[PDB]
Amino acid sequence: MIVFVRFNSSHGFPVEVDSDTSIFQLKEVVAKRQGVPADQLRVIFAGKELRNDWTVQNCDLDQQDIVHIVQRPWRKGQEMNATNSFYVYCKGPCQRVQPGKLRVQCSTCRQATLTLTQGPSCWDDVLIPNRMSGECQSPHCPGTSAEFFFKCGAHPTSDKETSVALHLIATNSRNITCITCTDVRSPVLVFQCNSRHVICLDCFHLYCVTRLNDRQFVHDPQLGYSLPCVAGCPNSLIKELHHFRILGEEQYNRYQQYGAEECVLQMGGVLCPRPGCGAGLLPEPDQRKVTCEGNGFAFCRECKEAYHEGECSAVFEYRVDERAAEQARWEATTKPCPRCHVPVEKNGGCMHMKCPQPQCRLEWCWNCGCEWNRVCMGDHWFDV
Ligand SMILES: [Cl-]
Ligand SMILES: [Zn+2]
Ligand SMILES: [Zn+2]
Ligand SMILES: [Zn+2]
Ligand SMILES: [Zn+2]
Ligand SMILES: [Zn+2]
Ligand SMILES: [Zn+2]
Ligand SMILES: [Zn+2]
Ligand SMILES: [Zn+2]
């Protein structure tokens, strides 16, 4: 039996397997072929992950079936009861999703001198430019508008060292199960669909890589190329395209070239079948021999394998769980003063609390129950 393996390419290379061949054995074959360790590979078939112990017969794999192989090690080590509200993509030295550090400055002079009228309570307050008001303490500054910025919280960063905020990603304090794997993971990406479907960062990676290989990225004229909710929900396309950077440097570079690759195929061209190389090749209208040479292997246009003569090789070329989708819905009193002991009422999502008593007037954090500081401000200014 022969199955096609899609590993960082739109074309699936043929691999010969038996009924008793396990997924781990298939991973081992592709591991030595690509020079990547087997414990880092993941087998995806029709949007579902195939486990190491399962055989070809168990998976119900037949002739000419296409399987995806994605390089991402599964990590169990995660924090469920994390205090952080924000997540950012650190483009060095982390090169992954990390808890964010929210900071404020004057939009005019760019100094940490702007005194806010009120603390932020939602994403709109920190994302929409010139939304929040205040007054700058710097001499002769007309600044009245707040400018919020996010940094990585996993290591020290300079005042200039900013990271892009990922507003779809959230800490799973609500213990919501993932739409694809049903596992309770943290953090989770929340799609902007009516149902607000929750997906773990592992599943989201598998979803994006397989759709890059299947070339099933939805095109929007006033946005570009993006993916909707895995459930196929209407009006759920990821607007903030910086969310595709979480896939890593290699996979995000593939996503960036997607637009240029689609233009070549639209004209009548072909792409390089070799993994890693996805060059937009434009050969002659009726030419079978195609070579990757705009500034390196010869291949057949029909079977997409190494160039040969005569006939092409005889062996030549999703629905979500209803209960899992229902369970994956993200949306579907008083605390005493740590010094005064008088109960204080919470107004909005803002964690910055102040005692209403005239003698105490203590500024404290709602969650931590300690005096208000830069750590609580950066880590969890508002509840999300
Ligand atoms: Cl976030
Ligand atoms: Zn970092
Ligand atoms: Zn200013
Ligand atoms: Zn998942
Ligand atoms: Zn959805
Ligand atoms: Zn090439
Ligand atoms: Zn051929
Ligand atoms: Zn008090
Ligand atoms: Zn706190």
Residue numbers in the entry: 1 to 83, 144 to 353, 355 to 356, 361 to 382, 391 to 405, 414 to 465
Authors' account:
Parkin has an N-terminal ubiquitin-like domain (Ubl) that shares 65% sequence similarity with ubiquitin, and a zinc-chelating RING0 domain immediately N-terminal to the RBR domains (Hristova et al, 2009). The RING1 domain recruits E2 enzymes, which carry charged ubiquitin and pass it to a catalytic cysteine in the parkin RING2 domain (Wenzel et al, 2011).
Therefore, we crystallized a version of parkin carrying a negative charge at position 65 (S65DUblR0RBR). This protein, as well as S65EUblR0RBR, showed increased ubiquitination activity compared to wild-type parkin that was further enhanced by phosphoubiquitin in a similar fashion to phosphorylated UblR0RBR. The structure of S65DUblR0RBR parkin was refined to 2.4 Å, with the same residues present in the density as in the wild-type UblR0RBR crystals. Superposition of S65DUblR0RBR and UblR0RBR (rmsd 0.58 Å) reveals no global conformational changes either in the Ubl domain, or in other parts of the protein (Fig3D). However, close inspection reveals that H227, E300 and H302 of the RING0/RING1 interface are remodelled in the S65DUblR0RBR structure to resemble the interface observed in the truncated R0RBR structures (Fig3E). Interestingly, the remodelling of these residues gives rise to a continuous basic patch comprising K151, H302 and R305 on the surface of Parkin, which is not present when the Ubl domain is unmodified (Fig3F). Taken together, these data suggest that the addition of a negative charge at position 65 of the Ubl domain alters the surface of parkin at the RING0/RING1 interface to facilitate optimal pUb binding.
